[PDB]
Design a protein around this nucleic acid. Structure first.
Ligand SMILES: [Mg+2]
Ligand SMILES: [Mg+2]
Ligand SMILES: [Mg+2]
Ligand SMILES: [Mg+2]
Ligand SMILES: [Mg+2]
Ligand SMILES: [Mg+2]
Ligand SMILES: [Zn+2]
Lengths: 750, 750
DNA sequence: ACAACCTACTACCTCC
DNA sequence: GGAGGTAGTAGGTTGT
DNA sequence: ACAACCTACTACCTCC
DNA sequence: GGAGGTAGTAGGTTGT
């Protein structure tokens, strides 16, 4: 239970840590220009207080405007984040920058071409204080650029350019490289036809744009020679592309682009299958390759300066060896509770008793009451007409097999409603047609008049447009139908012994997802948690507006052995900042309409990202008024620290906990650890900082196993945060069901 | 039926109309600066095509950048809008500008002080082509500014400044006049306390900000003398105000302001009752004062140039003399249809039979079926605790009188459900407390468990905060309760003969609004319209995000004699542009789920504002695919043309119709006419322009009388546009009710 | 040349 | 969109 | 010094 | 927010 792990950080020399620093207050308006972070960066310092425009500098100020001397302090009187930023700024002053380390790294890893793209290695650096010393954290990445322009890519043909723009519609971006400001633009298509918008009747505007781009930016003879080398002569046979900026606010400013002056932004859609396979084998590196590359880079650094004083550091991590099958309760064939450790199976063999007799019969733990009151549930089969006929018949046969197997294996032991499939419930329509969607909606309303719940199985094409998918799912959710979508590439995965049937793994995942979408919880967790309610919060952007329809919470709650899941919504915000006062007000209203008093209890809040100061003030006001004790955690997924091990473990570094809660089943890649940081306790209006104990890590590890979407995959995030992310994904696309169905479970977003 | 009316436009000289013009194409990026409208204005021209950067100029170009000569054309080959813009640009070139006409106007109307504010007259000009000639339209307005700064307003006292900021919280704006860019800021208060955020412990930052504002902008000795005259010496006893910009996007940039350097933006909240009475008597001018002032101004203009060649023009308008009581059907005391002209009454005596016997008994035309199935409806009385005790008892007594009178007068003749008032249904809570709101919501959920519809009567204070009103109404609408709110200033309006009762006008309006909120249509319209469906569309901004949750439609529909009102929602947009494809798709889905086929019918679309080109393309695609014939109108409320008459009339001017559909009951003010413009017919994918006939004006005038909010007030807008505006007002604040209640009428937003 | 994070998409591999 | 990981691209929010 | 419109708020008066 | 008008203040969207 004590293992030595290797990380990607090195110890720095302590002779670069500054002795004394000065604070300066800058007197200027935001509404003029010359941003305060730029003033701090040009004056070799950092920003402490953005509210009062206070900067910290290890040297004397050389500012041209008005300033005032605030204070003379030491380096140890600062918070640790500002110390890390100051050490990083001094390291960038002393020649240790990201692009110089990229220059050093490219001597051992040459740029590699893949088709029409080029991959170049890259180092990203950070500073972490641990044990009184500062460590430089290095992270390996790659940059994939285009070595050819758009006009030279298609062979200087207009029809090839039209086919390239029409084929990759939806994820095509063009970057202008002939201007001083390299802006990324998106091409504009016809809204109802889909053709690209080009002007192929202007041989004079092309010459005017060519001469304007030549005379405005490339004015020196060396710049003229570089322009004639890079782009060559003017081609008057090329069209003019209509494009908008990728930035949302200047999207109403039309831009005329030349295909000779733009390059395509890299996407993996623009490659074939083979080159995609080699490029994703090349980008994903294992732990040993990263260790060797970082060791070669650090050995190159250490023979040129005296800053790096050590190799890759070895830390101590505590392993997690706990059988999770002891805490997973389920029903047996007689409907009696039992842990899968007593049945000597795992989570992944819940449905193997359907077609075999050498395995115990597993019945679900919880069935909702509304499913018991409901006599029949209609099941519809919607098939896209763009598929081949054998794929259509195979999809209908697999849907009939799936529903019949579920109906037999559930009706032989427990009280389940009848899923009705009729020959008039099967439709084969074109999904990209609006009239077919409208007629299918009319027919499904006329079929589901005297009913409360229905199920649909949709079979789509290989590459359906993203608007059509959201439209079909939203129109099905508005008419009280839970839908499950299977694409064409999924239907090509067959069993190794039976080629005429689907793969059994996909059938079991579809069984579990269909059962979980109607509120059935097959297995629950048995653990007496220290908190009565566990609330997970996540935010997502809105699709059309510049705001946030995302912002929702998922509550795990019970009497003390957590079984119940309820999702609620924050509402609508302007940025990424939850109004906790309104959130807790409708939380108390909803839980009091359930019959539970939310006064004097304990609530554990897991927030995806970082808790802002406005959220802290709202939680303090809620704790002062309603008298609730709140414990908040901060979960971070994307950082630069990497642990070179593939095992369930955790590591205490600085004031954070980096845990690996799963193992990577692939043979390529390094797992990204999860960061727990800034445990806050709010009680009676006062916020205190706490220490992350072993019980919090153990409870988060236990909450990371409550997966209702699949039986063979282990997720990284805890279950309330994961279901909050799926709920804001559902609410972003406009997907909604009735309220009392949301109160009885019914995880329709999984 | 032929009356001569006077307008506010004068004929221009025809020797200023240009002979020939040139077109120029400008080659520059939007992402650099130097906007194309500024290039057109500095080069004495206008912009024709913003897509292709095409400008029109009557003279030769003097541009420094790259340009190309497009074409040489005449003035008569342009559209009329571009001709009006060119004539307006030439008039601003020849000295006829708005501020110079304001200089001319201030000789006859001196600036007038009201308290601490100053009112100055102002002329706004436009150009309208009519009959082959161009007319300059002049519009009278006023500008009210502040003659004193914020520090001199409160008497240079910190407690008076704190009381002034705390009293006018919510509508306080401060403009900085010590900078080159005059930006309007909003002060920042505490989120849960309400106190202003001031720094009264900095005698050094005030001097630094004073010296910085002195040395940055006012650097010349004349500017230093003007700065010392305007602001005087530095006061080090003043605090520093924390403020944000009023512009939404830079609201995260904190600004430190000095109260000596800022002025208060004018609001009528900052005046007493007497000064508000004189200032609104002074701002609202009748027709004769505007005629005399414009005649004096035009007589001053005509003796200085040769451009204006006539006085105020007299046009011909057609009067509307049609008795609207013939087309208003209602039920009698035998439930038999009858027009109020047969009963020899009007719209305004529908409830006078309740307390009198010399008037006929009037029963409503339509009662919804769901009200007939419902046996009982609970009625709650919520009273704010901030009121005085006599006001509380008077509000409860008036609510009991209102419900008892409605119950008796409706139960004696027709089949009405019983409105239940119990002694436990009356609550007296503090509305500004969150815990009282939460407990009231819990109690109302526990009281309305086995019920489908309830009614609430709320009595609030004089000045309730706008967040609390929306919160209370949203929490009542979420628990299936229709609410009606009466404030404290409404309860002080008593009858002239009975001082212990409410005014009978307010009681009748509350009766009609309460009856209309539960789907009861008292009177309908009898007219065979030329269109099967009439759809009104309006948009409103979202509260917190930068987008548009507004965008909704109201459909007036029947078999041909319009009686049924259904509101639907567009969804969520980015700007002011309706996606007509999705709107018509869920329209066909909703009307087919009602059992009506929407193929081959005619739909009249009334849009609040102007129909964009994307809406035109969407309507063309909908008409091509679904085969619907669409007729679109454009309704304009705010323009510069004024008709100096107080009578129902219409006037054909240019290609638009300016109608006065109502009379102003006040003794001050000039009525603003409504503009009908750009009648479009879309059939089989082609959009043609039509002419506004007499039948369209007559049908719009008939639709302008379908008011369900009051019986004594005549609205200007047509009824679908008005109800669309009220529906986006409801959906902006988050107010929503169940679906099948929305399908059965139930105008909850009136 | 402002950092440390967070979304939205595309692609491959691997499970019982 | 069988569900979960890892890779890449482009933007946007928050420090106080 | 870009026009013609559209929101969001505050205030008074007038109805049977 | 009795409902409708007219007055003022500040911003924001669309021309093609
Ligand atoms: Mg997040
Ligand atoms: Mg998320
Ligand atoms: Mg799913
Ligand atoms: Mg509008
Ligand atoms: Mg409106
Ligand atoms: Mg109302
Ligand atoms: Zn925005």
């Amino acid at each position: 239970m004590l293992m030595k792990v290797l990380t990607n950080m090195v110890k720095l020399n302590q002779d670069i840590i500054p002795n004394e620093i000065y604070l300066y207050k800058i007197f200027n308006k935001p509404e003029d220009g010359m941003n305060i972070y730029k003033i701090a960066y040009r004056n070799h310092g950092i920003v402490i207080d953005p509210q009062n425009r206070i900067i910290a500098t290890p040297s004397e100020l050389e500012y041209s405007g008005k300033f005032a001397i605030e204070d003379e302090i030491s380096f140890n009187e600062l918070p640790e984040n500002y110390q890390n930023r100051l050490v990083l700024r001094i390291l960038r002053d002393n020649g240790i920058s990201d692009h110089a380390l990229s220059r050093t790294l490219q001597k051992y890893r040459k740029p590699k071409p893949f088709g029409d793209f080029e991959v170049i290695p890259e180092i990203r650096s950070s500073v972490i204080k641990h044990g009184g010393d500062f460590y430089l954290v290095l992270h390996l990445s790659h940059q994939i650029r285009s070595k050819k322009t758009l006009w030279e890519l298609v062979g200087r043909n207009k029809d090839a350019l039209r086919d390239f723009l029409k084929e990759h519609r939806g994820t095509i971006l063009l970057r202008d490289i002939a201007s001083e400001h390299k802006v990324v633009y998106k091409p504009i298509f016809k809204r109802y036809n889909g053709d690209p918008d080009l002007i192929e009747d202007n041989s004079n505007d092309v010459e005017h744009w060519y001469d304007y781009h030549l005379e405005r930016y490339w004015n020196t003879p060396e710049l003229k020679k570089e322009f004639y080398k890079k782009f060559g002569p003017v081609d008057l046979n090329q069209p003019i592309i209509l494009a908008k900026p990728l930035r949302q606010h200047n999207r109403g400013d039309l831009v005329h682009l030349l295909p000779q002056f733009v390059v395509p932004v890299y996407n993996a859609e623009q490659l074939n299958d083979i080159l995609a396979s080699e490029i994703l084998e090349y980008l994903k590196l294992t732990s040993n390759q990263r260790i060797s590359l970082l060791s070669r880079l650090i050995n190159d650094i250490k023979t040129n300066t005296n800053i790096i004083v050590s190799s890759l550091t070895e830390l101590e991590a505590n392993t997690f060896d706990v059988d999770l099958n002891d805490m997973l309760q389920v029903r047996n064939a007689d409907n009696v509770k039992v842990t899968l450790s007593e049945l000597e199976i795992s989570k992944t063999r819940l449905f193997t008793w359907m077609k075999s007799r050498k395995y115990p019969v597993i019945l679900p733990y919880d069935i909702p009451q509304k499913l018991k009151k409901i006599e029949k549930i209609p099941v519809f089969i919607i098939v896209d007409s763009a598929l081949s006929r054998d794929i259509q018949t195979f999809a209908k046969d697999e849907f009939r097999y799936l529903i019949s197997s579920l109906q037999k294996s559930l009706s032989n032991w427990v009280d389940f409603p009848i899923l009705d499939i009729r020959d008039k419930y099967i439709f084969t329509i074109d999904l990209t047609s609006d009239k077919d969607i409208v007629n299918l909606s009319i027919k499904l309303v006329n079929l589901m008049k005297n009913a409360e719940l229905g199920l649909a199985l949709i079979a789509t094409r290989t590459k359906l447009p993203n608007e059509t998918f959201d439209e079909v799912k939203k129109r099905l959710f508005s008419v009280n139908i839970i839908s499950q979508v299977v694409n064409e590439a999924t239907l090509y995965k067959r069993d190794k012994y039976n080629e005429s049937r689907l793969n059994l793994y996909v059938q079991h995942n579809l069984l579990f997802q269909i059962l979980s979408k109607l509120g059935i919880k097959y297995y629950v967790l048995r653990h007496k948690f220290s908190y009565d309610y566990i609330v997970g919060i996540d935010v997502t952007p809105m699709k059309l507006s510049h705001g946030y329809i995302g912002g929702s919470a998922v509550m795990f709650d019970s009497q003390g052995y957590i079984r119940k899941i309820i999702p609620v919504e924050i509402g609508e915000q302007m940025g990424e900042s939850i109004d906790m006062k309104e959130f807790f007000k409708d939380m108390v209203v909803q839980f009091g309409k359930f019959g539970i008093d939310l006064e004097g209890k304990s609530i554990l809040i897991l927030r995806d990202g970082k808790i802002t100061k406005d959220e802290e003030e709202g939680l303090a006001y809620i704790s002062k008024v309603f008298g609730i004790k709140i414990t908040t955690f901060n979960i971070v997924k994307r950082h630069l620290l990497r642990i070179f091990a593939n095992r369930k473990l955790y590591l205490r570094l600085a004031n954070s906990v980096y845990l690996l809660p799963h193992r990577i089943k692939q043979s390529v890649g390094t797992p990204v650890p999860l960061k727990l940081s800034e445990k806050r306790l709010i009680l009676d209006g006062t916020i205190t900082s706490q220490e992350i104990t072993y019980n919090d890590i153990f409870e988060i590890l236990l909450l990371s196993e409550l997966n209702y979407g699949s039986i063979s995959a282990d997720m990284k995030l805890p279950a309330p945060v994961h279901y909050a992310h799926k709920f804001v994904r559902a609410l972003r696309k406009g997907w909604r069901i009735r309220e009392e169905l949301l109160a009885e479970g019914f995880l329709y977003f999984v």
